[PDB]
Amino acid sequence: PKGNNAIPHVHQKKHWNPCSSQKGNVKVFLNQPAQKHRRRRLRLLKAKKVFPRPLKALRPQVNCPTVRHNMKRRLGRGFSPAELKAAGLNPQYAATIGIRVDSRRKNKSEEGMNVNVQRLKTYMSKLVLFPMNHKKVQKGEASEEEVKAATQDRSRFGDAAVGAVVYPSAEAPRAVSAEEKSMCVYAFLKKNHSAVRFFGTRSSRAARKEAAKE
Amino acid sequence: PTRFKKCRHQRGSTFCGYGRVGKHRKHESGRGNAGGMHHHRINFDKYHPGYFGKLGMDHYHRKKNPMWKPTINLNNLSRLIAAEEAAKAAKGGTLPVVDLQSSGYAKLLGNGHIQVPCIVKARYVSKLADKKIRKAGGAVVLQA
RNA sequence: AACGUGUCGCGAUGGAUGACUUGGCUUCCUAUUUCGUUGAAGAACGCAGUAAAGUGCGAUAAGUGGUAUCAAUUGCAGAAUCAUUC
RNA sequence: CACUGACAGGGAACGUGAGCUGGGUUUAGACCGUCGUGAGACAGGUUGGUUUUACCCUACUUAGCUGGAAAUUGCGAGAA
RNA sequence: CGUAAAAGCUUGCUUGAUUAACGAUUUCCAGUACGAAUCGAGACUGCGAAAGCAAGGCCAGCGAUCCUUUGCGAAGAAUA
RNA sequence: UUAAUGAGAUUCCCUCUGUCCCGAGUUACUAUCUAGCGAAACGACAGUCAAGGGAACGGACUUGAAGGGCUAAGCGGGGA
RNA sequence: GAUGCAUCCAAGUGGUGUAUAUCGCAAACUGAUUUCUGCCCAGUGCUCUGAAUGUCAACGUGACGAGAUUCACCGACGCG
RNA sequence: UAAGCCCAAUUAGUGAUUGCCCAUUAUUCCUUUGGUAAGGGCGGAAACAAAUGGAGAAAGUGUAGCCCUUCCGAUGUAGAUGUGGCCUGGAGGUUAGGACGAAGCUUAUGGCGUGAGCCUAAGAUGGACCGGCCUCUAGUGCAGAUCUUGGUUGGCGUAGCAAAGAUCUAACGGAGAUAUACUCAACAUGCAACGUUGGAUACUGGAGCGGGGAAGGAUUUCGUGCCAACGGCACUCGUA
RNA sequence: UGCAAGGCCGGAAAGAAAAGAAUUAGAGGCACCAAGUGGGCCUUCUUCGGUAAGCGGAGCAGGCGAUGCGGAAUGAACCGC
RNA sequence: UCGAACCACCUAGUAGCUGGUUCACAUCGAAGUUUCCCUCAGGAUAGCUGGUGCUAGUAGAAGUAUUGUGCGGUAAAGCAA
RNA sequence: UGAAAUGAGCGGAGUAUUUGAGCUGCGCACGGCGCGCCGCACGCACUGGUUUCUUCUCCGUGAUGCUCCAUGUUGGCGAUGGAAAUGGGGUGCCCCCACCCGUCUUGAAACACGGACCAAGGAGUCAAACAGACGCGCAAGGGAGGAGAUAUGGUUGCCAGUACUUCUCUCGUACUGAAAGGGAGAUGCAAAAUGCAUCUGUGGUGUGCACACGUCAAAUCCGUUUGAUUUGCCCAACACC
RNA sequence: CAGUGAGCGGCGAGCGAAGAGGGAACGAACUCGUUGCCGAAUCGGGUCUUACAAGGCCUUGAGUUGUGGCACAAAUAUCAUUGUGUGGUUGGUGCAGGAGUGGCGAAAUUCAAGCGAAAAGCAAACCCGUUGCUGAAUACAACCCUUCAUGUGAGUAUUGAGCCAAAGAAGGUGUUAGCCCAUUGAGCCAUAAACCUGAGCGCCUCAUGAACUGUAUUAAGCGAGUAGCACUGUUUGGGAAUGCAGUGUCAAGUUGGCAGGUAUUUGUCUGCCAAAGUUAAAUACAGAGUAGGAAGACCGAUAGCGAACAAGUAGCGUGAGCGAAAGUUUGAAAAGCACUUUGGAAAGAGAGUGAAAUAGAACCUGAAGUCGUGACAAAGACAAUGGAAGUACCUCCAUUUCAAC
Ligand SMILES: NC[C@@H]1O[C@H](O[C@H]2[C@@H](O)[C@H](O[C@@H]3[C@@H](O)[C@H](N)C[C@H](N)[C@H]3O[C@H]3O[C@H](CO)[C@@H](O)[C@H](O)[C@H]3N)O[C@@H]2CO)[C@H](N)[C@@H](O)[C@@H]1O
Ligand SMILES: [K+]
Ligand SMILES: [K+]
Ligand SMILES: [K+]
Ligand SMILES: [K+]
Ligand SMILES: [K+]
Ligand SMILES: [K+]
Ligand SMILES: [K+]
Ligand SMILES: [K+]
Ligand SMILES: [K+]
Ligand SMILES: [K+]
Ligand SMILES: [K+]
Ligand SMILES: [K+]
Numbered sequence A: 001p002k003g004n005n006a007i008p009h010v011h012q013k014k015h016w017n018p019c020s021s022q023k024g025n026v027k028v029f030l031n032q033p034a035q036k037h038r039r040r041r042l043r044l045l046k047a048k049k050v051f052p053r054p055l056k057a058l059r060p061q062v063n064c065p066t067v068r069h070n071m072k073r074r075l076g077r078g079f080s081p082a083e084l085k086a087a088g089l090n091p092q093y094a095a096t097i098g099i100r101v102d103s104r105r106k107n108k109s110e111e112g113m114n115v116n117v118q119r120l121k122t123y124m125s126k127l128v129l130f131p132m133n134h135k136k137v138q139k140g141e142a143s144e145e146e147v148k149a150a151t152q153d154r155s156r157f158g159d160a161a162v163g164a165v166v167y168p169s170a171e172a173p174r175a176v177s178a179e180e181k182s183m184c185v186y187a188f189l190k191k192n193h194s195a196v197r198f199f200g201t202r203s204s205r206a207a208r209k210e211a212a213k214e
Numbered sequence B: 001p002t003r004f005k006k007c008r009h010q011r012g013s014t015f016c017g018y019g020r021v022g023k024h025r026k027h028e029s030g031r032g033n034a035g036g037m038h039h040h041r042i043n044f045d046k047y048h049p050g051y052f053g054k055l056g057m058d059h060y061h062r063k064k065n066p067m068w069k070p071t072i073n074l075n076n077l078s079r080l081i082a083a084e085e086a087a088k089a090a091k092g093g094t095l096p097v098v099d100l101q102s103s104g105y106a107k108l109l110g111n112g113h114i115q116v117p118c119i120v121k122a123r124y125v126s127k128l129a130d131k132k133i134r135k136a137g138g139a140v141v142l143q144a
Numbered sequence C: 001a002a003c004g005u006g007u008c009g010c011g012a013u014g015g016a017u018g019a020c021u022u023g024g025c026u027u028c029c030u031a032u033u034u035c036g037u038u039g040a041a042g043a044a045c046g047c048a049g050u051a052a053a054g055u056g057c058g059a060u061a062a063g064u065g066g067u068a069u070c071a072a073u074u075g076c077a078g079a080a081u082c083a084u085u086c
Numbered sequence D: 001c002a003c004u005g006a007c008a009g010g011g012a013a014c015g016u017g018a019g020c021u022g023g024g025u026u027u028a029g030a031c032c033g034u035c036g037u038g039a040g041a042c043a044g045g046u047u048g049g050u051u052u053u054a055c056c057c058u059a060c061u062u063a064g065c066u067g068g069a070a071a072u073u074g075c076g077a078g079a080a
Numbered sequence E: 001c002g003u004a005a006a007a008g009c010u011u012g013c014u015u016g017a018u019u020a021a022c023g024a025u026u027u028c029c030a031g032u033a034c035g036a037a038u039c040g041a042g043a044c045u046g047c048g049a050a051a052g053c054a055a056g057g058c059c060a061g062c063g064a065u066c067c068u069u070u071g072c073g074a075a076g077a078a079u080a
Numbered sequence F: 001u002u003a004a005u006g007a008g009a010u011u012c013c014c015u016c017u018g019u020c021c022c023g024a025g026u027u028a029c030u031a032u033c034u035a036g037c038g039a040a041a042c043g044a045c046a047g048u049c050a051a052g053g054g055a056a057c058g059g060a061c062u063u064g065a066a067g068g069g070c071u072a073a074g075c076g077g078g079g080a
Numbered sequence G: 001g002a003u004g005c006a007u008c009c010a011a012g013u014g015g016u017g018u019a020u021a022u023c024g025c026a027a028a029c030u031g032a033u034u035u036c037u038g039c040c041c042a043g044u045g046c047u048c049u050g051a052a053u054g055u056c057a058a059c060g061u062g063a064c065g066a067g068a069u070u071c072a073c074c075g076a077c078g079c080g
Numbered sequence H: 001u002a003a004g005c006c007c008a009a010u011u012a013g014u015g016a017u018u019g020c021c022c023a024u025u026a027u028u029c030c031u032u033u034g035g036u037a038a039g040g041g042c043g044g045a046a047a048c049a050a051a052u053g054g055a056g057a058a059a060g061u062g063u064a065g066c067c068c069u070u071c072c073g074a075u076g077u078a079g080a081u082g083u084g085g086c087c088u089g090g091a092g093g094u095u096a097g098g099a100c101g102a103a104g105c106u107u108a109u110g111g112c113g114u115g116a117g118c119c120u121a122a123g124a125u126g127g128a129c130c131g132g133c134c135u136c137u138a139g140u141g142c143a144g145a146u147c148u149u150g151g152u153u154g155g156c157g158u159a160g161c162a163a164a165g166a167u168c169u170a171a172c173g174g175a176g177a178u179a180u181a182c183u184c185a186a187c188a189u190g191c192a193a194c195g196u197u198g199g200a201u202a203c204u205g206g207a208g209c210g211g212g213g214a215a216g217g218a219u220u221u222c223g224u225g226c227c228a229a230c231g232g233c234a235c236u237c238g239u240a
Numbered sequence I: 001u002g003c004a005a006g007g008c009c010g011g012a013a014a015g016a017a018a019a020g021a022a023u024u025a026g027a028g029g030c031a032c033c034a035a036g037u038g039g040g041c042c043u044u045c046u047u048c049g050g051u052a053a054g055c056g057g058a059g060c061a062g063g064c065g066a067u068g069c070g071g072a073a074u075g076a077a078c079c080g081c
Numbered sequence J: 001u002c003g004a005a006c007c008a009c010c011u012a013g014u015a016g017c018u019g020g021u022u023c024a025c026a027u028c029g030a031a032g033u034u035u036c037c038c039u040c041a042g043g044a045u046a047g048c049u050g051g052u053g054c055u056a057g058u059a060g061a062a063g064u065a066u067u068g069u070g071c072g073g074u075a076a077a078g079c080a081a
Numbered sequence K: 001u002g003a004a005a006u007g008a009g010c011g012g013a014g015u016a017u018u019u020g021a022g023c024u025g026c027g028c029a030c031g032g033c034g035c036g037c038c039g040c041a042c043g044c045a046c047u048g049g050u051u052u053c054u055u056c057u058c059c060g061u062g063a064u065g066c067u068c069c070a071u072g073u074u075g076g077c078g079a080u081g082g083a084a085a086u087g088g089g090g091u092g093c094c095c096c097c098a099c100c101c102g103u104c105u106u107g108a109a110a111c112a113c114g115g116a117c118c119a120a121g122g123a124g125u126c127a128a129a130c131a132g133a134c135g136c137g138c139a140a141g142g143g144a145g146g147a148g149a150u151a152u153g154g155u156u157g158c159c160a161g162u163a164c165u166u167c168u169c170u171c172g173u174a175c176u177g178a179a180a181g182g183g184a185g186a187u188g189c190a191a192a193a194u195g196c197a198u199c200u201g202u203g204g205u206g207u208g209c210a211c212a213c214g215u216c217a218a219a220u221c222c223g224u225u226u227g228a229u230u231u232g233c234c235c236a237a238c239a240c241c
Numbered sequence L: 001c002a003g004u005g006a007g008c009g010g011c012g013a014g015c016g017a018a019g020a021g022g023g024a025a026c027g028a029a030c031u032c033g034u035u036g037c038c039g040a041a042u043c044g045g046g047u048c049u050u051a052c053a054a055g056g057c058c059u060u061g062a063g064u065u066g067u068g069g070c071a072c073a074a075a076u077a078u079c080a081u082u083g084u085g086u087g088g089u090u091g092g093u094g095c096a097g098g099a100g101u102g103g104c105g106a107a108a109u110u111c112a113a114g115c116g117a118a119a120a121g122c123a124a125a126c127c128c129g130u131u132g133c134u135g136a137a138u139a140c141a142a143c144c145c146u147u148c149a150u151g152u153g154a155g156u157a158u159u160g161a162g163c164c165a166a167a168g169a170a171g172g173u174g175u176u177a178g179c180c181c182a183u184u185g186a187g188c189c190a191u192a193a194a195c196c197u198g199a200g201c202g203c204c205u206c207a208u209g210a211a212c213u214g215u216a217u218u219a220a221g222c223g224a225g226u227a228g229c230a231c232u233g234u235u236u237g238g239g240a241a242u243g244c245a246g247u248g249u250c251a252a253g254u255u256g257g258c259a260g261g262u263a264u265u266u267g268u269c270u271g272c273c274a275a276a277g278u279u280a281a282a283u284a285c286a287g288a289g290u291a292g293g294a295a296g297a298c299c300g301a302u303a304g305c306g307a308a309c310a311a312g313u314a315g316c317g318u319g320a321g322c323g324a325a326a327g328u329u330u331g332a333a334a335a336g337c338a339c340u341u342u343g344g345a346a347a348g349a350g351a352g353u354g355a356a357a358u359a360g361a362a363c364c365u366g367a368a369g370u371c372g373u374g375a376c377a378a379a380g381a382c383a384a385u386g387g388a389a390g391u392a393c394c395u396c397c398a399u400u401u402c403a404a405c
């Protein structure tokens, strides 16, 4: 018999299985440990080739979109020119000293820009710029002693110079104020929701009433 | 493992538990969910009522991120408060502050008796939850 | 009696089994790794002292040259040198 | 029709096809009538249309060899 | 099968053949639907002086998904 | 309707005959025996009958009747 | 009667009857000669140098509406 | 004077109420196995060397079952489940064997197990690997699918090798003979079959088993050697 | 103060006498996950169609199928078990 | 090879139909019936069966009697109702 | 063959013991006659009496043994042999049993199909979704996965493993409505279109493990333990709200 | 995310994505057309410079029907003038180191015991043990008893004594090898170009950046039979139409255009700017190749590729195509059986080699089935086989017993 079972929806009706008459359509992961080792080996080789430059270029901090992730922070593509100008860096020169530049990202709030400006300022203070000619050092370029003392970041996210992404600090414990004691939170929230939700109907009803007056 | 299967037990049984009369044929009932309204109707109706038909409005291009709204009740608020803060929390004094959206919750529901009073930062709150938390000595502060 | 039957010992016919494995199958990795009118891939015919197939080679034909190696090849035969290179 | 004393009825896988025969019935060709729009149909008519194998075992028919009464043995002894 | 101051006949008034908050149950039966039923509860009614009696003509006369199509969500009021 | 024509279907007559009454004799090549050579089909196991029951038609079973063993040439009853 | 009929062909300034031209070419039926081949156009087909004709699509024309939409008119082989 | 039919008895008018024979049934005894099993013991009581009473005793589903006592059931197609149940290739562990003989193979080699099977013995077998135990793992167990491949086999020295007429003779050639215990003159104890040459007899009968070509074949042509296989008999012959 | 219903507090209980005055190899209930089967056949009585059938078709219950053993000489279903 | 040639591939095409399906013992052990189905050689679905159990081991026990109390229109009988 | 001889049987002790049968006392039952009279086969109580006949009567051994095995008599055969025995194996023969396997089928020994022999090969597998049973970890939380990180930036290889990390993701802790959207504690006081107060708490009732109070009955080796039951709380569950 | 409380679907069978989040990769960005300002400053071809130079000179040859330069959001002139620089990717010229590639390159017993039987053991955790003890093989060889013969291949085994290890690595060598061989490491040597290295380091040449001060600026534009729209067709989860195609029709840019997953007309808002082009990595290699490596709980000659082998071969088909069988695996070494004898030969009978010839040649092992042979067992005709009980005879089987046992 069949009995009481879930109704199957296994979705395996195509020629996925390799056989005598079908090339199949499959993907296996038997090379996964080897590819992990190769990727790490390539990263170590890349670090050696670009030494002493950091393996990962500097990236800004951005706020994740959508109401589900707006509380989270992560690294973005690149620094906007507005952030770079505020930090005192020409964007074309910044790309030559290991700073990622994104001319697409807007800066719609001061807090969003300020955190990235501080990131650039911290990176600029820690930067050791090798002279093009160690005989005739120009302004901004590093001395010979700093050149020999240079080391390579190599961190996964390239954030040793500036630190991890910064989250807002948790609020400290406190007492309840008198307004919070007596104020009806639900009524305030419901009224605001109803203002938007019934905005169209309320406006039409008022307009119909005004037309009734005239 | 293969050695634990009925096939090992059935070596020498000829019919392997499928019978001499009926036999083990290829597809005696049809393939998959065939005959849901014909010759399998009783199985579908008694075990999966509601399977056939249409119901309700359509929502093209559903995006679950806008609809994100997990809930937590008042009686579960101790899960988001550290033990040391809960011990020092007393009605009418300094209370721990719970940030629901950073904890992964969007609405405070309010089932049961709240154990430790606290200040709760929530996007939404039910009216019963807001009433009970204020009576218990806590508060709810709206957040976004 | 004779054919025929049965058993044991020993033989014949017949190549299973075990042991063996320079093969297959399958999974990974490395890279100044991708042919041709400057005639490719494929097809044909030839080439050894002895040579059917196969392999290698192209009338310079089981190979010429160069580098390294450091006393062979080998069924028979032949062969200056028994050797810093020649 | 004729003879005869008489021309009784039946069975044996409606005896008997590796015994025969193949006229009929029952393929594919073709004609007619009736039927069907048609392809086609008709216990309706018509004409033409491959009948395979025994050397085995029994049975039967003949044809040879040859043991054997404890029906092969017991030495187990019975005379029309 | 049942029925006689009716359940029949005649007649006077009527629209209980409407609605009925997913109440429960019988028949078929897997104790699933569908169709017919039974006992209710609420609304508005009809008849009757009144107890009462009626949500069709007792029990046969009928229909899923999808799709199509019709009815209901009247007007005005609410600082939400 | 039709002369001529037809390995076309049909009926009769003359001639003719082993088609038959009714079988007989002869020949070549076989079969048969030998020398050399040397298969296939087929093969559950096997292989005497009568009746009885039985999947209603047995070589196996029940009860009876037969049955010494091994061979050569035939034969087509059976081996559904 | 070639600006054709039949017709190949996925397609072209493509192909066949056609190197042809009605005493031709293409498509059916019957089946020498002789003697004949009657009646029926209702049906089903085919066909007509028959309508200021009903109906049939797209395109067109006009209109209500903010517009989508909708409506009105026009509309050929074919069928009638 | 039933060994038939109907009735009625159990050794018979004598003294009492079981004539006899056959079950996978009944009763009972022994053993196995499984329970919805029922109980008891498990704090080593004491004592005890050899020369000359013993051994065991596990807190336990399942084993050679911890031991003992007790009671009940036991067949079965399709089917289900269980098994310190059996067996095979490989892996992780552990413990062993083997040139004084591993695997494989052979058996009137016995022993053990209800059984799947395990173990020993012998090889006048073999010549280099391999066993047990716990766990893991899988292309893991064959009697039969008109099953696949290979080999064998009765039929069977059987059916047959019968169209195209037909061959005979001598000599030579050849291992292919005229091939012999005793007896015995040769017959009755080496048969049959051959290649060539010469004779004889016949056939093809010019629309030919005549002489040349195409297609097709491709050395079959020629000479010498040669008889293993092939020319369905034969060959000393041959398109071998 | 009656009736209907849901409870509370007490009482009495041959735990069911006597009169033929029950018996039980009677642990009651509750789930979960699934296999094979869904051609049947026979018989005692009842029984329908058919002249009838080793025919077709039902009821109650046994049996074969799935099962031998001991009997009816022989027989899936009869007798005994 | 023709009432749709041959070759390779899709193709291990599908089959409710036919055939096959490899060790042992042990504890249990059927059904051919119900309803629905283009269903009638097949399935779903209840029943029968195994396994896993759960729950306070006689608790809501019974293919059987007895007593009390209901239900019936077949066998008989009747046509003098 | 006495390695616990439970015996009316074995061992001691004594001529007694009390079963029945006969014969009989009183009362009561029982039977016949119509108030108490007659009978009473010999019933019940006095466990009546008489002992004339018939019997035997009483007492006695725990395991300091948890389990298994181990103790006669008379001959024959066997004194080391190519021996005697018992079991196994092989072949034949007697008497009695016994239809050919597999398969479909109501029914096969079938005049139903596959079935000459042997060897080797030959058929419930792998993957994904779900579910239940059982094992393991953690638990209102569980767990990845991908990817990084370095022991390993090392090593033919062992090392494609093992060890470590995740503000994430996922399944859950909350469910409902077609949706817009709402969203679940108890008690007390009281009935406010969001009522107040308290926070050690099964929402209530019925049935229900263990455990705690007692209480009866059976058995004890007298320590108890085998049942039943009253009350309380009732766990898990089930049923009404 | 997600087999989805998206959607598509005789809404049946089935089908079925996208944004976000954790990550991989990433020095990732550029070119043209247009617009404005310039206007041959460009390209080929000769010729010279060590040079088919990103160079000079020349050239109507191309080209004004427009090559090229400068600026356009990473932006905020160009264009001289002088000084400071830079470019190994401008072309010549020549000097290093490295990587890569190839060649070369390590340890320790052939130690002691000799042969059918001690080149074997026992002393029961550990130790005593660097010690003590010693032999059931006076063997075996086929019915038993004599006599005379015959037989043990190579030590990677055993025991004893040592040794190497930054090397125990797993291949070879006549049995199982760290020390017999090869191997296993540091390291050494040699290099066309290319590759990597203060964009390695110089010279010529050629280009070129920033800072100097003077120097002329704000104005315009940014891709058309294209996008849309109608019909048809196809595709998609995309549903009053996701992408595309044919034809018809065809824009906007002074209320600009496209996207914002229910069609229409409106009004806002958000993101972006189609109809030109280039671009490394993370990804694929589901029947490929070249040069090398690593391997495997895989198969083990009817398996595994069809093919372990003169296999896509022999063979088959007119052809497209089809397509096997087959391990030469004797032995440690050919020592591959001289020689005698019979035979025409093949071979037989002897004799030799070898540890073994029943290892004798495509030869290790040599099963089943079938057959021959010798010995024996019997047996009528019940087809044979089978079951249960005995018995007769046999038995290279097992076990027990042999003295008051
Ligand atoms: N003896 C009767 C038969 O023996 C046969 O088996 C026999 C043989 O297979 C088996 O092999 C024997 C071996 O025993 C004996 N000791 C040595 C002999 N070499 C072997 O014989 C074998 O090798 C020889 C050649 O060497 C061959 O001729 C022979 O065919 C082969 N069977 O010996 C067995 C005798 O016990 C079958 N198993 C069976 O059919 C039957 O019982
Ligand atoms: K079922
Ligand atoms: K955000
Ligand atoms: K059946
Ligand atoms: K006939
Ligand atoms: K035909
Ligand atoms: K004819
Ligand atoms: K639809
Ligand atoms: K003619
Ligand atoms: K008989
Ligand atoms: K005519
Ligand atoms: K037991
Ligand atoms: K146990």
Ligand SMILES: [K+]
Pocket: H143
């Ligand atoms: K079988």
Ligand SMILES: [K+]
Pocket: H156
């Ligand atoms: K034969």
Ligand SMILES: [K+]
Pocket: H221
């Ligand atoms: K010639």
Ligand SMILES: [K+]
Pocket: H230
């Ligand atoms: K031949």
Ligand SMILES: [K+]
Pocket: L156, L177
């Ligand atoms: K070695």
Ligand SMILES: [Mg+2]
Pocket: A131, A132, A133, A134, L198
């Ligand atoms: Mg520099």
Ligand SMILES: [Mg+2]
Pocket: B013
């Ligand atoms: Mg079975």
Ligand SMILES: [Mg+2]
Pocket: B016, B017, B018, I035
């Ligand atoms: Mg099953």
Ligand SMILES: [Mg+2]
Pocket: B022, B023, B028
């Ligand atoms: Mg079935």
Ligand SMILES: [Mg+2]
Pocket: B021, B022, I039
């Ligand atoms: Mg069936």
Ligand SMILES: [Mg+2]
Pocket: B054
């Ligand atoms: Mg709808």
Ligand SMILES: [Mg+2]
Pocket: C051, C052
């Ligand atoms: Mg050659």
Ligand SMILES: [Mg+2]
Pocket: none
């Ligand atoms: Mg030349």
Ligand SMILES: [Mg+2]
Pocket: none
């Ligand atoms: Mg040299």
Ligand SMILES: [Mg+2]
Pocket: D014
């Ligand atoms: Mg008849």
Ligand SMILES: [Mg+2]
Pocket: D014
């Ligand atoms: Mg007949």
